[PDB]
Amino acid sequence: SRRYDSRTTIFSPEGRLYQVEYAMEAIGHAGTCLGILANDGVLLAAERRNIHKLLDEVFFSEKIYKLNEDMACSVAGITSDANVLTNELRLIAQRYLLQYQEPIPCEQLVTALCDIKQAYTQFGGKRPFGVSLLYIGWDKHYGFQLYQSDPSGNYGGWKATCIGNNSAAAVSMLKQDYKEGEMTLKSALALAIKVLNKTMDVSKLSAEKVEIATLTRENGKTVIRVLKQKEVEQLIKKHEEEEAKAEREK
Amino acid sequence: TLDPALMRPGRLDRKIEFSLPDLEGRTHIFKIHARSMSVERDIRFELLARLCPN
Amino acid sequence: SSAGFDRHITIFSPEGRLYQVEYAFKAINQGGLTSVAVRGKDCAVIVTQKKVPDKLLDSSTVTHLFKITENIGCVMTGMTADSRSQVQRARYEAANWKYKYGYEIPVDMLCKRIADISQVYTQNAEMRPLGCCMILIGIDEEQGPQVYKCDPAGYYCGFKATAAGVKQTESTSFLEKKVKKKFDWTFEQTVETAITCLSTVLSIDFKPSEIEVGVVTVENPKFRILTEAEIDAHLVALAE
Amino acid sequence: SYDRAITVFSPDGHLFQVEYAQEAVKKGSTAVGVRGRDIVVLGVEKKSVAKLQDERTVRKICALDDNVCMAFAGLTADARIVINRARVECQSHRLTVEDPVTVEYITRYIASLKQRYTQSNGRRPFGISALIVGFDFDGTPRLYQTDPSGTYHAWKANAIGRGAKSVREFLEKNYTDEAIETDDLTIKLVIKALLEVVQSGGKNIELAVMRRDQSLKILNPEEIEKYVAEIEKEKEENE
Amino acid sequence: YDRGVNTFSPEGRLFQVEYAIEAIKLGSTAIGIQTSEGVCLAVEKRITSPLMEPSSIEKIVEIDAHIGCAMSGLIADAKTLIDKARVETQNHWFTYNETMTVESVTQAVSNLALQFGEEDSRPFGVALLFGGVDEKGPQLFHMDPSGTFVQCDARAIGSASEGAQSSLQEVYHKSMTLKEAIKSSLIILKQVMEEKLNATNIELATVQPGQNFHMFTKEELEEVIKDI
Amino acid sequence: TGYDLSASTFSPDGRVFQVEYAMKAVENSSTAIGIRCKDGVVFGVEKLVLSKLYEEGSNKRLFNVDRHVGMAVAGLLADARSLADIAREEASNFRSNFGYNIPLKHLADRVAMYVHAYTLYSAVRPFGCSFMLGSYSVNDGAQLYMIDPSGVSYGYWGCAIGKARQAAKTEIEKLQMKEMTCRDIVKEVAKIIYIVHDEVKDKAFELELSWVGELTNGRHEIVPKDIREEAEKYAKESLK
Amino acid sequence: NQYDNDVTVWSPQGRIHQIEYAMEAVKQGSATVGLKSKTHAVLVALKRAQSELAAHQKKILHVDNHIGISIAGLTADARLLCNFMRQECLDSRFVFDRPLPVSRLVSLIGSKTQIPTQRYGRRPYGVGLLIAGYDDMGPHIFQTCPSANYFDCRAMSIGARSQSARTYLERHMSEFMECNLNELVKHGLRALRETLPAEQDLTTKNVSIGIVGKDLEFTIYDDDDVSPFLEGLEERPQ
Amino acid sequence: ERGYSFSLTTFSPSGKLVQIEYALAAVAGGAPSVGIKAANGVVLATEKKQKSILYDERSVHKVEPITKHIGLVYSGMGPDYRVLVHRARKLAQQYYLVYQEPIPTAQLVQRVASVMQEYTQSGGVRPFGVSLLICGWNEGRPYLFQSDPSGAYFAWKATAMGKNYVNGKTFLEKRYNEDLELEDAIHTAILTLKESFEGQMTEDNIEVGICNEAGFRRLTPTEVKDYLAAIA
């Protein structure tokens, strides 16, 4: 009757949360996303968690979801929970355009979602979401932006953030190595290939285990580029060459 | 720690327990443990015992 | 083992099972009754005894042989209060097939509608799963007779000759030995095996007053409950 | 449809959820605020900025209208609901009555929001504690506060967050009207109080004033260094 | 440690309503006296900090024009009851052109003292003292979170509850005067409080048959203390 | 234990204890019998008086549902007055939609479904009542029915509800049923109430008799009790 | 002990304990006595006060011109059933233009209290009544209980130590037909004084009387008009 | 019901969901099944047994069609399978009433898994105990997808489910190539189903449905008797 209720609403007797803490301490396992910007352009490096020899990849966009003509996202968490939010967040951006005939700015898209994620923690005793995702995009007020989302409903503006807990060493690398207004689309891409080489345990960084989506502002089109195969491979051959060249002083 | 063989009539017969003071037995003890020390002659002891239920 | 409340409500176990539904399968056996269904080449027999403990009790308001529609009959085992609730559902959705669709409901399609409802009671955790069984008969156009069995888990399948109740593993073991030897099955061949299976398993050799026969025929598709006289007529006829 | 009481009584005569909610305010960054007779001031501590990241989204002082200013503690998601609730009400008050909203009216709106929110069924109570600062008509600068239980007062100097009682003690031996006479003296006083709690390395303090005539202005980080230097200079004269 | 919230004790009483009465005892004290010249009313503010402005804290709240109040217990749970008690007098006056009597106000308040549940929450945590003048003269009533409405001649509630009633029955009679009842009450107050009696810790409000608008501020309050 | 709190859970062997608990609640109540002769039904209720404790004629358990339908409730008395409102309300809507009188076979079914519906959910509990339904009609004869707290309802000639259940129907079956006028049955009822329940626990007890049949033209009413009073005069003739 | 918490849960002994706990709440109230005659339905109650200066809590309360009740439980459930009770009398007054018989009023009450004693999450009404009415077949005395059992009695008493009041009415039940009003009332207050300790009694400050009769509308007397009734008494012997 | 609606699936202190992992345990102990996608069509093969000689095989069907070109099998439990079949039947109709065009196979699986996920978060219910294999030959290219009780979709070339699925997984990893024909796919599908089968493999012990580009087609037992000659 009432003795089957798990009581996800009550605070801890410690005086903090108890159930939302479980999802945020879960979310660091199995998934590694990041994104960088310092100049015109912003990228999203992903990581294929399991690449088995009997899959199809007929969609050509596995983790990256183009949710708008100007924005996209990178989700890491429960896959089934991802399809719930991304179908909802895509519909949030579209009713804005119906009302104003103007493309949705990126902050008030994020605050639209995070208020939905919060309200399912307080009332109802509903299971909270197990999703932390990222945001890229371009607007008419600031331009190229990055955002972090939490299962609590808390967000923030960033420039080199990540998701997965294996990337704690990467953020230390990014505090060690980051530039202020010197992104090219060679500088940031070679830096991202450098990060996933060390942080992921993939030996020699097989090009089918990673995935990179970029965004540039072309004329007025804001082209969302998803690069396919060989440019990744020659990038790794470029990165291994720059590793082999620099180790000659050792 | 109660022996029924002690409460056999011939050893122990009467039950006398002690309970907590209501108000005044407390205030009396305050009047006991203040007269030996230097206190102000313009202070009361009822208010202190009201702050101490048990 | 038991995790959470898997002994109490319909959720899963760590072994990938659940327990309330398989408790309900042996909630039939508190009824203390065994019913046999046999399908022949042009008929379908239902046979079920009854126990009359009191002389101060009628011989009319007892028999589990119910009539769903004019061409479909059934038999109920398990407890009785859950059985008649199951029958009113079957009577109700048979009539809605007429009003919506126009023609008479097949005996196969009715078992889907019943097993869907029993599914939901398994499914939502705050209600009881209704432990009682279900056996139907009936004649289909260009398909002959059919025999089905709904279950409180929510599945059904067709059969050729299948009993339910308390004694199955002796009753089904006898029916397998009867069927696989590939004999003939006409009408009275089908009725006599439905008696002698229930006769040999229960080991009674009774008086014609306990059992009831609910045969349906190709030549007469009306569901028909046999008279006690003609029940005695078949019993002495197979007797040599 | 959710019918389950969450907040019930205790055998000694207390609650449970409200005392658990005020712990979340105790585990938060500190924010103080004083007032004066012409201009007000409020600041916040414990920035803990990653120094490579964006910070226009990490702002924790906002405004409900052209008079009313905010400063909260506790968690952050529950604060955002309260703020966007309060912006609607002070806008709809302006719709019917053609005044600016008085600062006393909006604090009754927040406190009555939060009380019926601990009263009802199925609802986790809020975990914030706001400082509401604004100077009404006839030039009356004042500041109120909230509580997760839903009570509210009027203070002359508040402190909340991780370690307010030390700050409340530091403001307790600071009962001078002369510090609320000069404007820059009041601001360095807040910086003197905030440096008494946080380590305050010139990049962890965000103060903001309001001169009862204009919308709030975040001071420049040069001015934070300018005020900390004269605070160090005036404190170095202890000999 | 989680039984039902709506459950009789095996002895016969209730569980959570019993706990609600206990939550009053940690509240600020309050004293009211009914006198044929008028109903007086007293309370203690219990200021916690000098930084806290005192007059933002109140316990006496007017109701219509001639009915006061006195809360003790939780603050914000009383503000629900006060706002409803104000409205239901106005529904009475704008449907009957007469003032709702003091007894009949408390009936309307005490209806939802025990209307909590799952369909159609928890019991309130405040005791009240309604006092005023109606056509039956000056009146004074008392209620509780059990919804047990009652009339008292001079009730004292709050933390000092038992000691206040005992000292009050010591000196009270039927033929009191108003100034006598005022100065008697604060003598009880400064015996049971812990700070000194000044113009910032207590407040009064007296309603008379003629001066129905109960009105008491400081600089008369300081006159009362210095004459006693 | 652990499984006997809700009506939604089963036992590990497959029964429901909340129905089992409510059955023995009715068993700890006073005795009420019902018997039909060849042209009517006679009701009899042993009714206890403690010392005075009421009038003579309070809280009778011989309810009167329809113009031709009686009640013989026993068990928890407050729930019995609920079923009397439900059974009354059911017969009225039969009169409204249709417009001949309610048959007794339906009124047993329509009520027992509402009893059965309270044995599924964890929200409500099972009723703690059991009762008799007695009618008479010139097209259908007399019928006598019997509902338990589970919902199992069917026909009897003589039944008995209360503490004296097996002890009372021991000697009901000693009589005849077809060769009896109900006026003879009236004094035959009164001896059985007088035979059972020796006044060791309870000194004072009443005897309320109700009587529907051919002589009352199908209308159900109480016997003329103070009139002619031949039951108790004949009942106390059994001192040895 | 685990099955003594909810109303829905039965017992392995067969008795719901939440009803039995509500019976004990009725015994915590004060005592009151209702009796009748051929023409009158006098009930007499016993007030209690909380302190020496507070007023006594009222017991008898008016319902209609020919029906009045007493009270023996909680006060919220008192007014909750009272407001239901006032509502039902005026509806029959508005529709049929006749006063309700008392017998069919109380069956509405026993139906009303049944539902919160079966569904989950509800408490029973912890209160007992003594209804005294008058209609076209005479006066009536009805007592109730939280177990939704109403009783057509001729004289009962409920509350605290009501047993000694019942023993008085057993050995005087014959006298209650041939008595008019004065010896009808002063029979009844002799029943309450056996529910008292031997150092205090009825002081015209802790006693109310409600009479309803043939040509007499239901009237409550208290504190001024009890002194004409409190005469011709005696002290209790030792 | 009353208004409880509380989700009986919450996160572990480790950070995993407990009931979904238990629901996957029921799927792994079900009837084996295999599905192969082979560049001109997709072949579904389940494995149907009968505990007696008394059951009937013309009654319960495992390979079940959806539109005219979309088939569907399962590997978990039985009564829960028929629920989401009737759900998916109606779910393909609102596509065809609106768009007047047969629903693409990728579009069903987005909708079916959305039904199944949203079913687990809501209160009072357990998850399903069924995994699916959906196929179809839409717009030239054929397709083969797999769902699960969590509500996650995949896109296999050739997978297996039910009992001993890892053994069938390694077998297809050596048997399947870049491309075959449809008939070769049927021959290796019976080969991998004959891995964990029992001795009698008649026309009744297996049950096979294909998807041509001409459409969905379910195989009658006559051809399956004829095709099982020199099987595997």
PDB file of C-alpha atoms in Angstrom, chain E residues 74-220:
ATOM      1  CA  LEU E  74       5.041  28.417  14.153  1.00  0.00           C
ATOM      2  CA  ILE E  75       4.952  31.736  12.367  1.00  0.00           C
ATOM      3  CA  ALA E  76       4.096  30.904   8.791  1.00  0.00           C
ATOM      4  CA  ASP E  77       1.470  28.293   9.620  1.00  0.00           C
ATOM      5  CA  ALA E  78      -0.477  31.013  11.418  1.00  0.00           C
ATOM      6  CA  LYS E  79      -0.415  33.336   8.406  1.00  0.00           C
ATOM      7  CA  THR E  80      -2.636  30.881   6.556  1.00  0.00           C
ATOM      8  CA  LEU E  81      -5.231  30.979   9.332  1.00  0.00           C
ATOM      9  CA  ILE E  82      -5.060  34.759   9.747  1.00  0.00           C
ATOM     10  CA  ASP E  83      -5.706  35.503   6.088  1.00  0.00           C
ATOM     11  CA  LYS E  84      -8.696  33.175   6.046  1.00  0.00           C
ATOM     12  CA  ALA E  85     -10.118  34.662   9.242  1.00  0.00           C
ATOM     13  CA  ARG E  86      -9.946  38.115   7.670  1.00  0.00           C
ATOM     14  CA  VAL E  87     -11.797  37.032   4.527  1.00  0.00           C
ATOM     15  CA  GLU E  88     -14.667  35.249   6.235  1.00  0.00           C
ATOM     16  CA  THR E  89     -15.569  38.349   8.212  1.00  0.00           C
ATOM     17  CA  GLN E  90     -15.758  40.226   4.920  1.00  0.00           C
ATOM     18  CA  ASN E  91     -17.981  37.543   3.437  1.00  0.00           C
ATOM     19  CA  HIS E  92     -20.192  38.043   6.458  1.00  0.00           C
ATOM     20  CA  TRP E  93     -20.341  41.811   6.147  1.00  0.00           C
ATOM     21  CA  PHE E  94     -20.865  41.880   2.404  1.00  0.00           C
ATOM     22  CA  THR E  95     -23.705  39.395   2.667  1.00  0.00           C
ATOM     23  CA  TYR E  96     -25.418  40.566   5.875  1.00  0.00           C
ATOM     24  CA  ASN E  97     -24.293  44.198   6.572  1.00  0.00           C
ATOM     25  CA  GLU E  98     -23.270  43.300  10.104  1.00  0.00           C
ATOM     26  CA  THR E  99     -20.070  42.436  11.909  1.00  0.00           C
ATOM     27  CA  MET E 100     -19.361  38.757  12.473  1.00  0.00           C
ATOM     28  CA  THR E 101     -19.252  38.075  16.208  1.00  0.00           C
ATOM     29  CA  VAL E 102     -16.073  36.938  17.924  1.00  0.00           C
ATOM     30  CA  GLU E 103     -17.348  33.457  18.735  1.00  0.00           C
ATOM     31  CA  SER E 104     -18.629  32.896  15.219  1.00  0.00           C
ATOM     32  CA  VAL E 105     -15.233  33.846  13.762  1.00  0.00           C
ATOM     33  CA  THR E 106     -13.485  31.114  15.720  1.00  0.00           C
ATOM     34  CA  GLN E 107     -16.004  28.543  14.514  1.00  0.00           C
ATOM     35  CA  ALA E 108     -15.048  29.338  10.944  1.00  0.00           C
ATOM     36  CA  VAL E 109     -11.342  29.066  11.726  1.00  0.00           C
ATOM     37  CA  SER E 110     -11.586  25.818  13.688  1.00  0.00           C
ATOM     38  CA  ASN E 111     -13.366  23.931  10.901  1.00  0.00           C
ATOM     39  CA  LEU E 112     -10.143  23.344   8.975  1.00  0.00           C
ATOM     40  CA  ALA E 113      -8.038  22.693  12.041  1.00  0.00           C
ATOM     41  CA  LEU E 114      -8.429  18.942  11.431  1.00  0.00           C
ATOM     42  CA  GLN E 115      -9.223  18.734   7.706  1.00  0.00           C
ATOM     43  CA  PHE E 116      -5.948  17.136   6.610  1.00  0.00           C
ATOM     44  CA  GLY E 117      -5.736  13.929   4.623  1.00  0.00           C
ATOM     45  CA  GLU E 118      -4.784  12.405   1.296  1.00  0.00           C
ATOM     46  CA  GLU E 119      -7.866  13.437  -0.712  1.00  0.00           C
ATOM     47  CA  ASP E 120     -10.307  16.390  -0.590  1.00  0.00           C
ATOM     48  CA  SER E 121      -1.440  17.374   4.723  1.00  0.00           C
ATOM     49  CA  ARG E 122      -0.666  17.760   8.437  1.00  0.00           C
ATOM     50  CA  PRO E 123      -2.224  19.509  11.445  1.00  0.00           C
ATOM     51  CA  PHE E 124      -1.299  23.122  12.093  1.00  0.00           C
ATOM     52  CA  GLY E 125       1.201  24.124  14.735  1.00  0.00           C
ATOM     53  CA  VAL E 126      -0.182  27.287  16.308  1.00  0.00           C
ATOM     54  CA  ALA E 127      -2.441  28.237  19.207  1.00  0.00           C
ATOM     55  CA  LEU E 128      -4.508  31.418  19.000  1.00  0.00           C
ATOM     56  CA  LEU E 129      -6.207  33.959  21.270  1.00  0.00           C
ATOM     57  CA  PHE E 130      -9.079  35.858  19.690  1.00  0.00           C
ATOM     58  CA  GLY E 131     -10.348  38.823  21.653  1.00  0.00           C
ATOM     59  CA  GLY E 132     -12.754  41.562  20.796  1.00  0.00           C
ATOM     60  CA  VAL E 133     -16.006  43.380  21.388  1.00  0.00           C
ATOM     61  CA  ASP E 134     -19.291  42.247  19.844  1.00  0.00           C
ATOM     62  CA  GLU E 135     -22.944  42.907  20.735  1.00  0.00           C
ATOM     63  CA  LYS E 136     -22.442  40.614  23.753  1.00  0.00           C
ATOM     64  CA  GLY E 137     -19.779  42.915  25.177  1.00  0.00           C
ATOM     65  CA  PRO E 138     -16.073  42.133  25.363  1.00  0.00           C
ATOM     66  CA  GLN E 139     -15.157  38.514  24.647  1.00  0.00           C
ATOM     67  CA  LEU E 140     -12.063  36.327  24.666  1.00  0.00           C
ATOM     68  CA  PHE E 141     -11.667  32.893  23.122  1.00  0.00           C
ATOM     69  CA  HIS E 142      -8.958  30.282  22.762  1.00  0.00           C
ATOM     70  CA  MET E 143      -8.349  27.533  20.237  1.00  0.00           C
ATOM     71  CA  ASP E 144      -5.741  24.847  19.668  1.00  0.00           C
ATOM     72  CA  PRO E 145      -4.522  22.599  16.817  1.00  0.00           C
ATOM     73  CA  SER E 146      -7.078  19.986  17.852  1.00  0.00           C
ATOM     74  CA  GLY E 147      -9.830  22.395  16.814  1.00  0.00           C
ATOM     75  CA  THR E 148     -11.150  22.446  20.376  1.00  0.00           C
ATOM     76  CA  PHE E 149     -12.737  25.858  20.585  1.00  0.00           C
ATOM     77  CA  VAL E 150     -13.289  27.258  24.097  1.00  0.00           C
ATOM     78  CA  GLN E 151     -13.887  30.538  25.953  1.00  0.00           C
ATOM     79  CA  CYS E 152     -11.503  31.651  28.696  1.00  0.00           C
ATOM     80  CA  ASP E 153     -11.662  34.653  30.995  1.00  0.00           C
ATOM     81  CA  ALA E 154      -7.900  35.154  31.141  1.00  0.00           C
ATOM     82  CA  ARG E 155      -5.817  32.565  29.301  1.00  0.00           C
ATOM     83  CA  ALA E 156      -2.021  32.493  29.064  1.00  0.00           C
ATOM     84  CA  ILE E 157      -0.281  30.303  26.481  1.00  0.00           C
ATOM     85  CA  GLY E 158       3.182  29.839  25.016  1.00  0.00           C
ATOM     86  CA  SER E 159       6.279  28.549  26.783  1.00  0.00           C
ATOM     87  CA  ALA E 160       5.350  30.037  30.141  1.00  0.00           C
ATOM     88  CA  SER E 161       1.996  28.287  30.186  1.00  0.00           C
ATOM     89  CA  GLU E 162       1.670  26.448  33.475  1.00  0.00           C
ATOM     90  CA  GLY E 163       3.484  28.984  35.639  1.00  0.00           C
ATOM     91  CA  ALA E 164       1.638  31.851  34.002  1.00  0.00           C
ATOM     92  CA  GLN E 165      -1.831  30.387  34.644  1.00  0.00           C
ATOM     93  CA  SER E 166      -0.956  29.687  38.269  1.00  0.00           C
ATOM     94  CA  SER E 167       0.259  33.230  38.896  1.00  0.00           C
ATOM     95  CA  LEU E 168      -2.771  34.593  37.068  1.00  0.00           C
ATOM     96  CA  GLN E 169      -5.353  32.687  39.111  1.00  0.00           C
ATOM     97  CA  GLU E 170      -3.529  34.074  42.145  1.00  0.00           C
ATOM     98  CA  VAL E 171      -4.604  37.642  41.347  1.00  0.00           C
ATOM     99  CA  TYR E 172      -7.773  37.973  39.264  1.00  0.00           C
ATOM    100  CA  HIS E 173     -11.381  38.797  40.014  1.00  0.00           C
ATOM    101  CA  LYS E 174     -14.528  39.624  38.085  1.00  0.00           C
ATOM    102  CA  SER E 175     -14.602  43.376  38.730  1.00  0.00           C
ATOM    103  CA  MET E 176     -11.249  44.239  37.175  1.00  0.00           C
ATOM    104  CA  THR E 177     -10.566  47.583  35.614  1.00  0.00           C
ATOM    105  CA  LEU E 178      -8.664  48.033  32.363  1.00  0.00           C
ATOM    106  CA  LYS E 179      -5.548  49.781  33.686  1.00  0.00           C
ATOM    107  CA  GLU E 180      -5.434  47.234  36.508  1.00  0.00           C
ATOM    108  CA  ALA E 181      -5.580  44.332  34.056  1.00  0.00           C
ATOM    109  CA  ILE E 182      -2.849  45.894  31.922  1.00  0.00           C
ATOM    110  CA  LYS E 183      -0.334  46.431  34.714  1.00  0.00           C
ATOM    111  CA  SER E 184      -1.077  43.015  36.215  1.00  0.00           C
ATOM    112  CA  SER E 185      -0.198  41.252  32.969  1.00  0.00           C
ATOM    113  CA  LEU E 186       3.273  42.709  32.463  1.00  0.00           C
ATOM    114  CA  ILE E 187       4.200  41.905  36.062  1.00  0.00           C
ATOM    115  CA  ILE E 188       3.517  38.297  35.076  1.00  0.00           C
ATOM    116  CA  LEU E 189       5.568  38.839  31.908  1.00  0.00           C
ATOM    117  CA  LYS E 190       8.759  40.184  33.460  1.00  0.00           C
ATOM    118  CA  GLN E 191       8.686  37.325  35.954  1.00  0.00           C
ATOM    119  CA  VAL E 192       8.591  34.701  33.201  1.00  0.00           C
ATOM    120  CA  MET E 193      10.848  36.233  30.563  1.00  0.00           C
ATOM    121  CA  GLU E 194      14.636  36.211  30.403  1.00  0.00           C
ATOM    122  CA  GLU E 195      15.564  39.642  29.055  1.00  0.00           C
ATOM    123  CA  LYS E 196      14.659  42.945  30.669  1.00  0.00           C
ATOM    124  CA  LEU E 197      11.276  44.548  30.050  1.00  0.00           C
ATOM    125  CA  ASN E 198      11.664  47.446  27.632  1.00  0.00           C
ATOM    126  CA  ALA E 199       9.952  49.100  24.679  1.00  0.00           C
ATOM    127  CA  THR E 200      11.229  46.453  22.268  1.00  0.00           C
ATOM    128  CA  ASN E 201      10.453  43.061  23.814  1.00  0.00           C
ATOM    129  CA  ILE E 202       6.701  43.274  24.425  1.00  0.00           C
ATOM    130  CA  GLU E 203       3.644  44.836  22.848  1.00  0.00           C
ATOM    131  CA  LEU E 204       0.050  45.437  23.902  1.00  0.00           C
ATOM    132  CA  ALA E 205      -3.255  45.897  22.093  1.00  0.00           C
ATOM    133  CA  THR E 206      -6.483  46.715  23.898  1.00  0.00           C
ATOM    134  CA  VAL E 207      -9.950  46.836  22.354  1.00  0.00           C
ATOM    135  CA  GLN E 208     -12.681  48.819  24.133  1.00  0.00           C
ATOM    136  CA  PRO E 209     -16.410  49.147  23.361  1.00  0.00           C
ATOM    137  CA  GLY E 210     -15.861  52.757  22.334  1.00  0.00           C
ATOM    138  CA  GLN E 211     -12.290  52.715  21.034  1.00  0.00           C
ATOM    139  CA  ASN E 212     -12.815  49.614  18.933  1.00  0.00           C
ATOM    140  CA  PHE E 213      -9.729  50.425  16.895  1.00  0.00           C
ATOM    141  CA  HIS E 214      -7.146  48.815  19.151  1.00  0.00           C
ATOM    142  CA  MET E 215      -4.112  51.042  19.111  1.00  0.00           C
ATOM    143  CA  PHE E 216      -0.981  50.764  21.226  1.00  0.00           C
ATOM    144  CA  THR E 217       2.532  51.890  20.263  1.00  0.00           C
ATOM    145  CA  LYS E 218       5.721  52.824  22.119  1.00  0.00           C
ATOM    146  CA  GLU E 219       6.093  56.102  24.100  1.00  0.00           C
ATOM    147  CA  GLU E 220       2.867  55.111  25.771  1.00  0.00           C
TER     148      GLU E 220
END
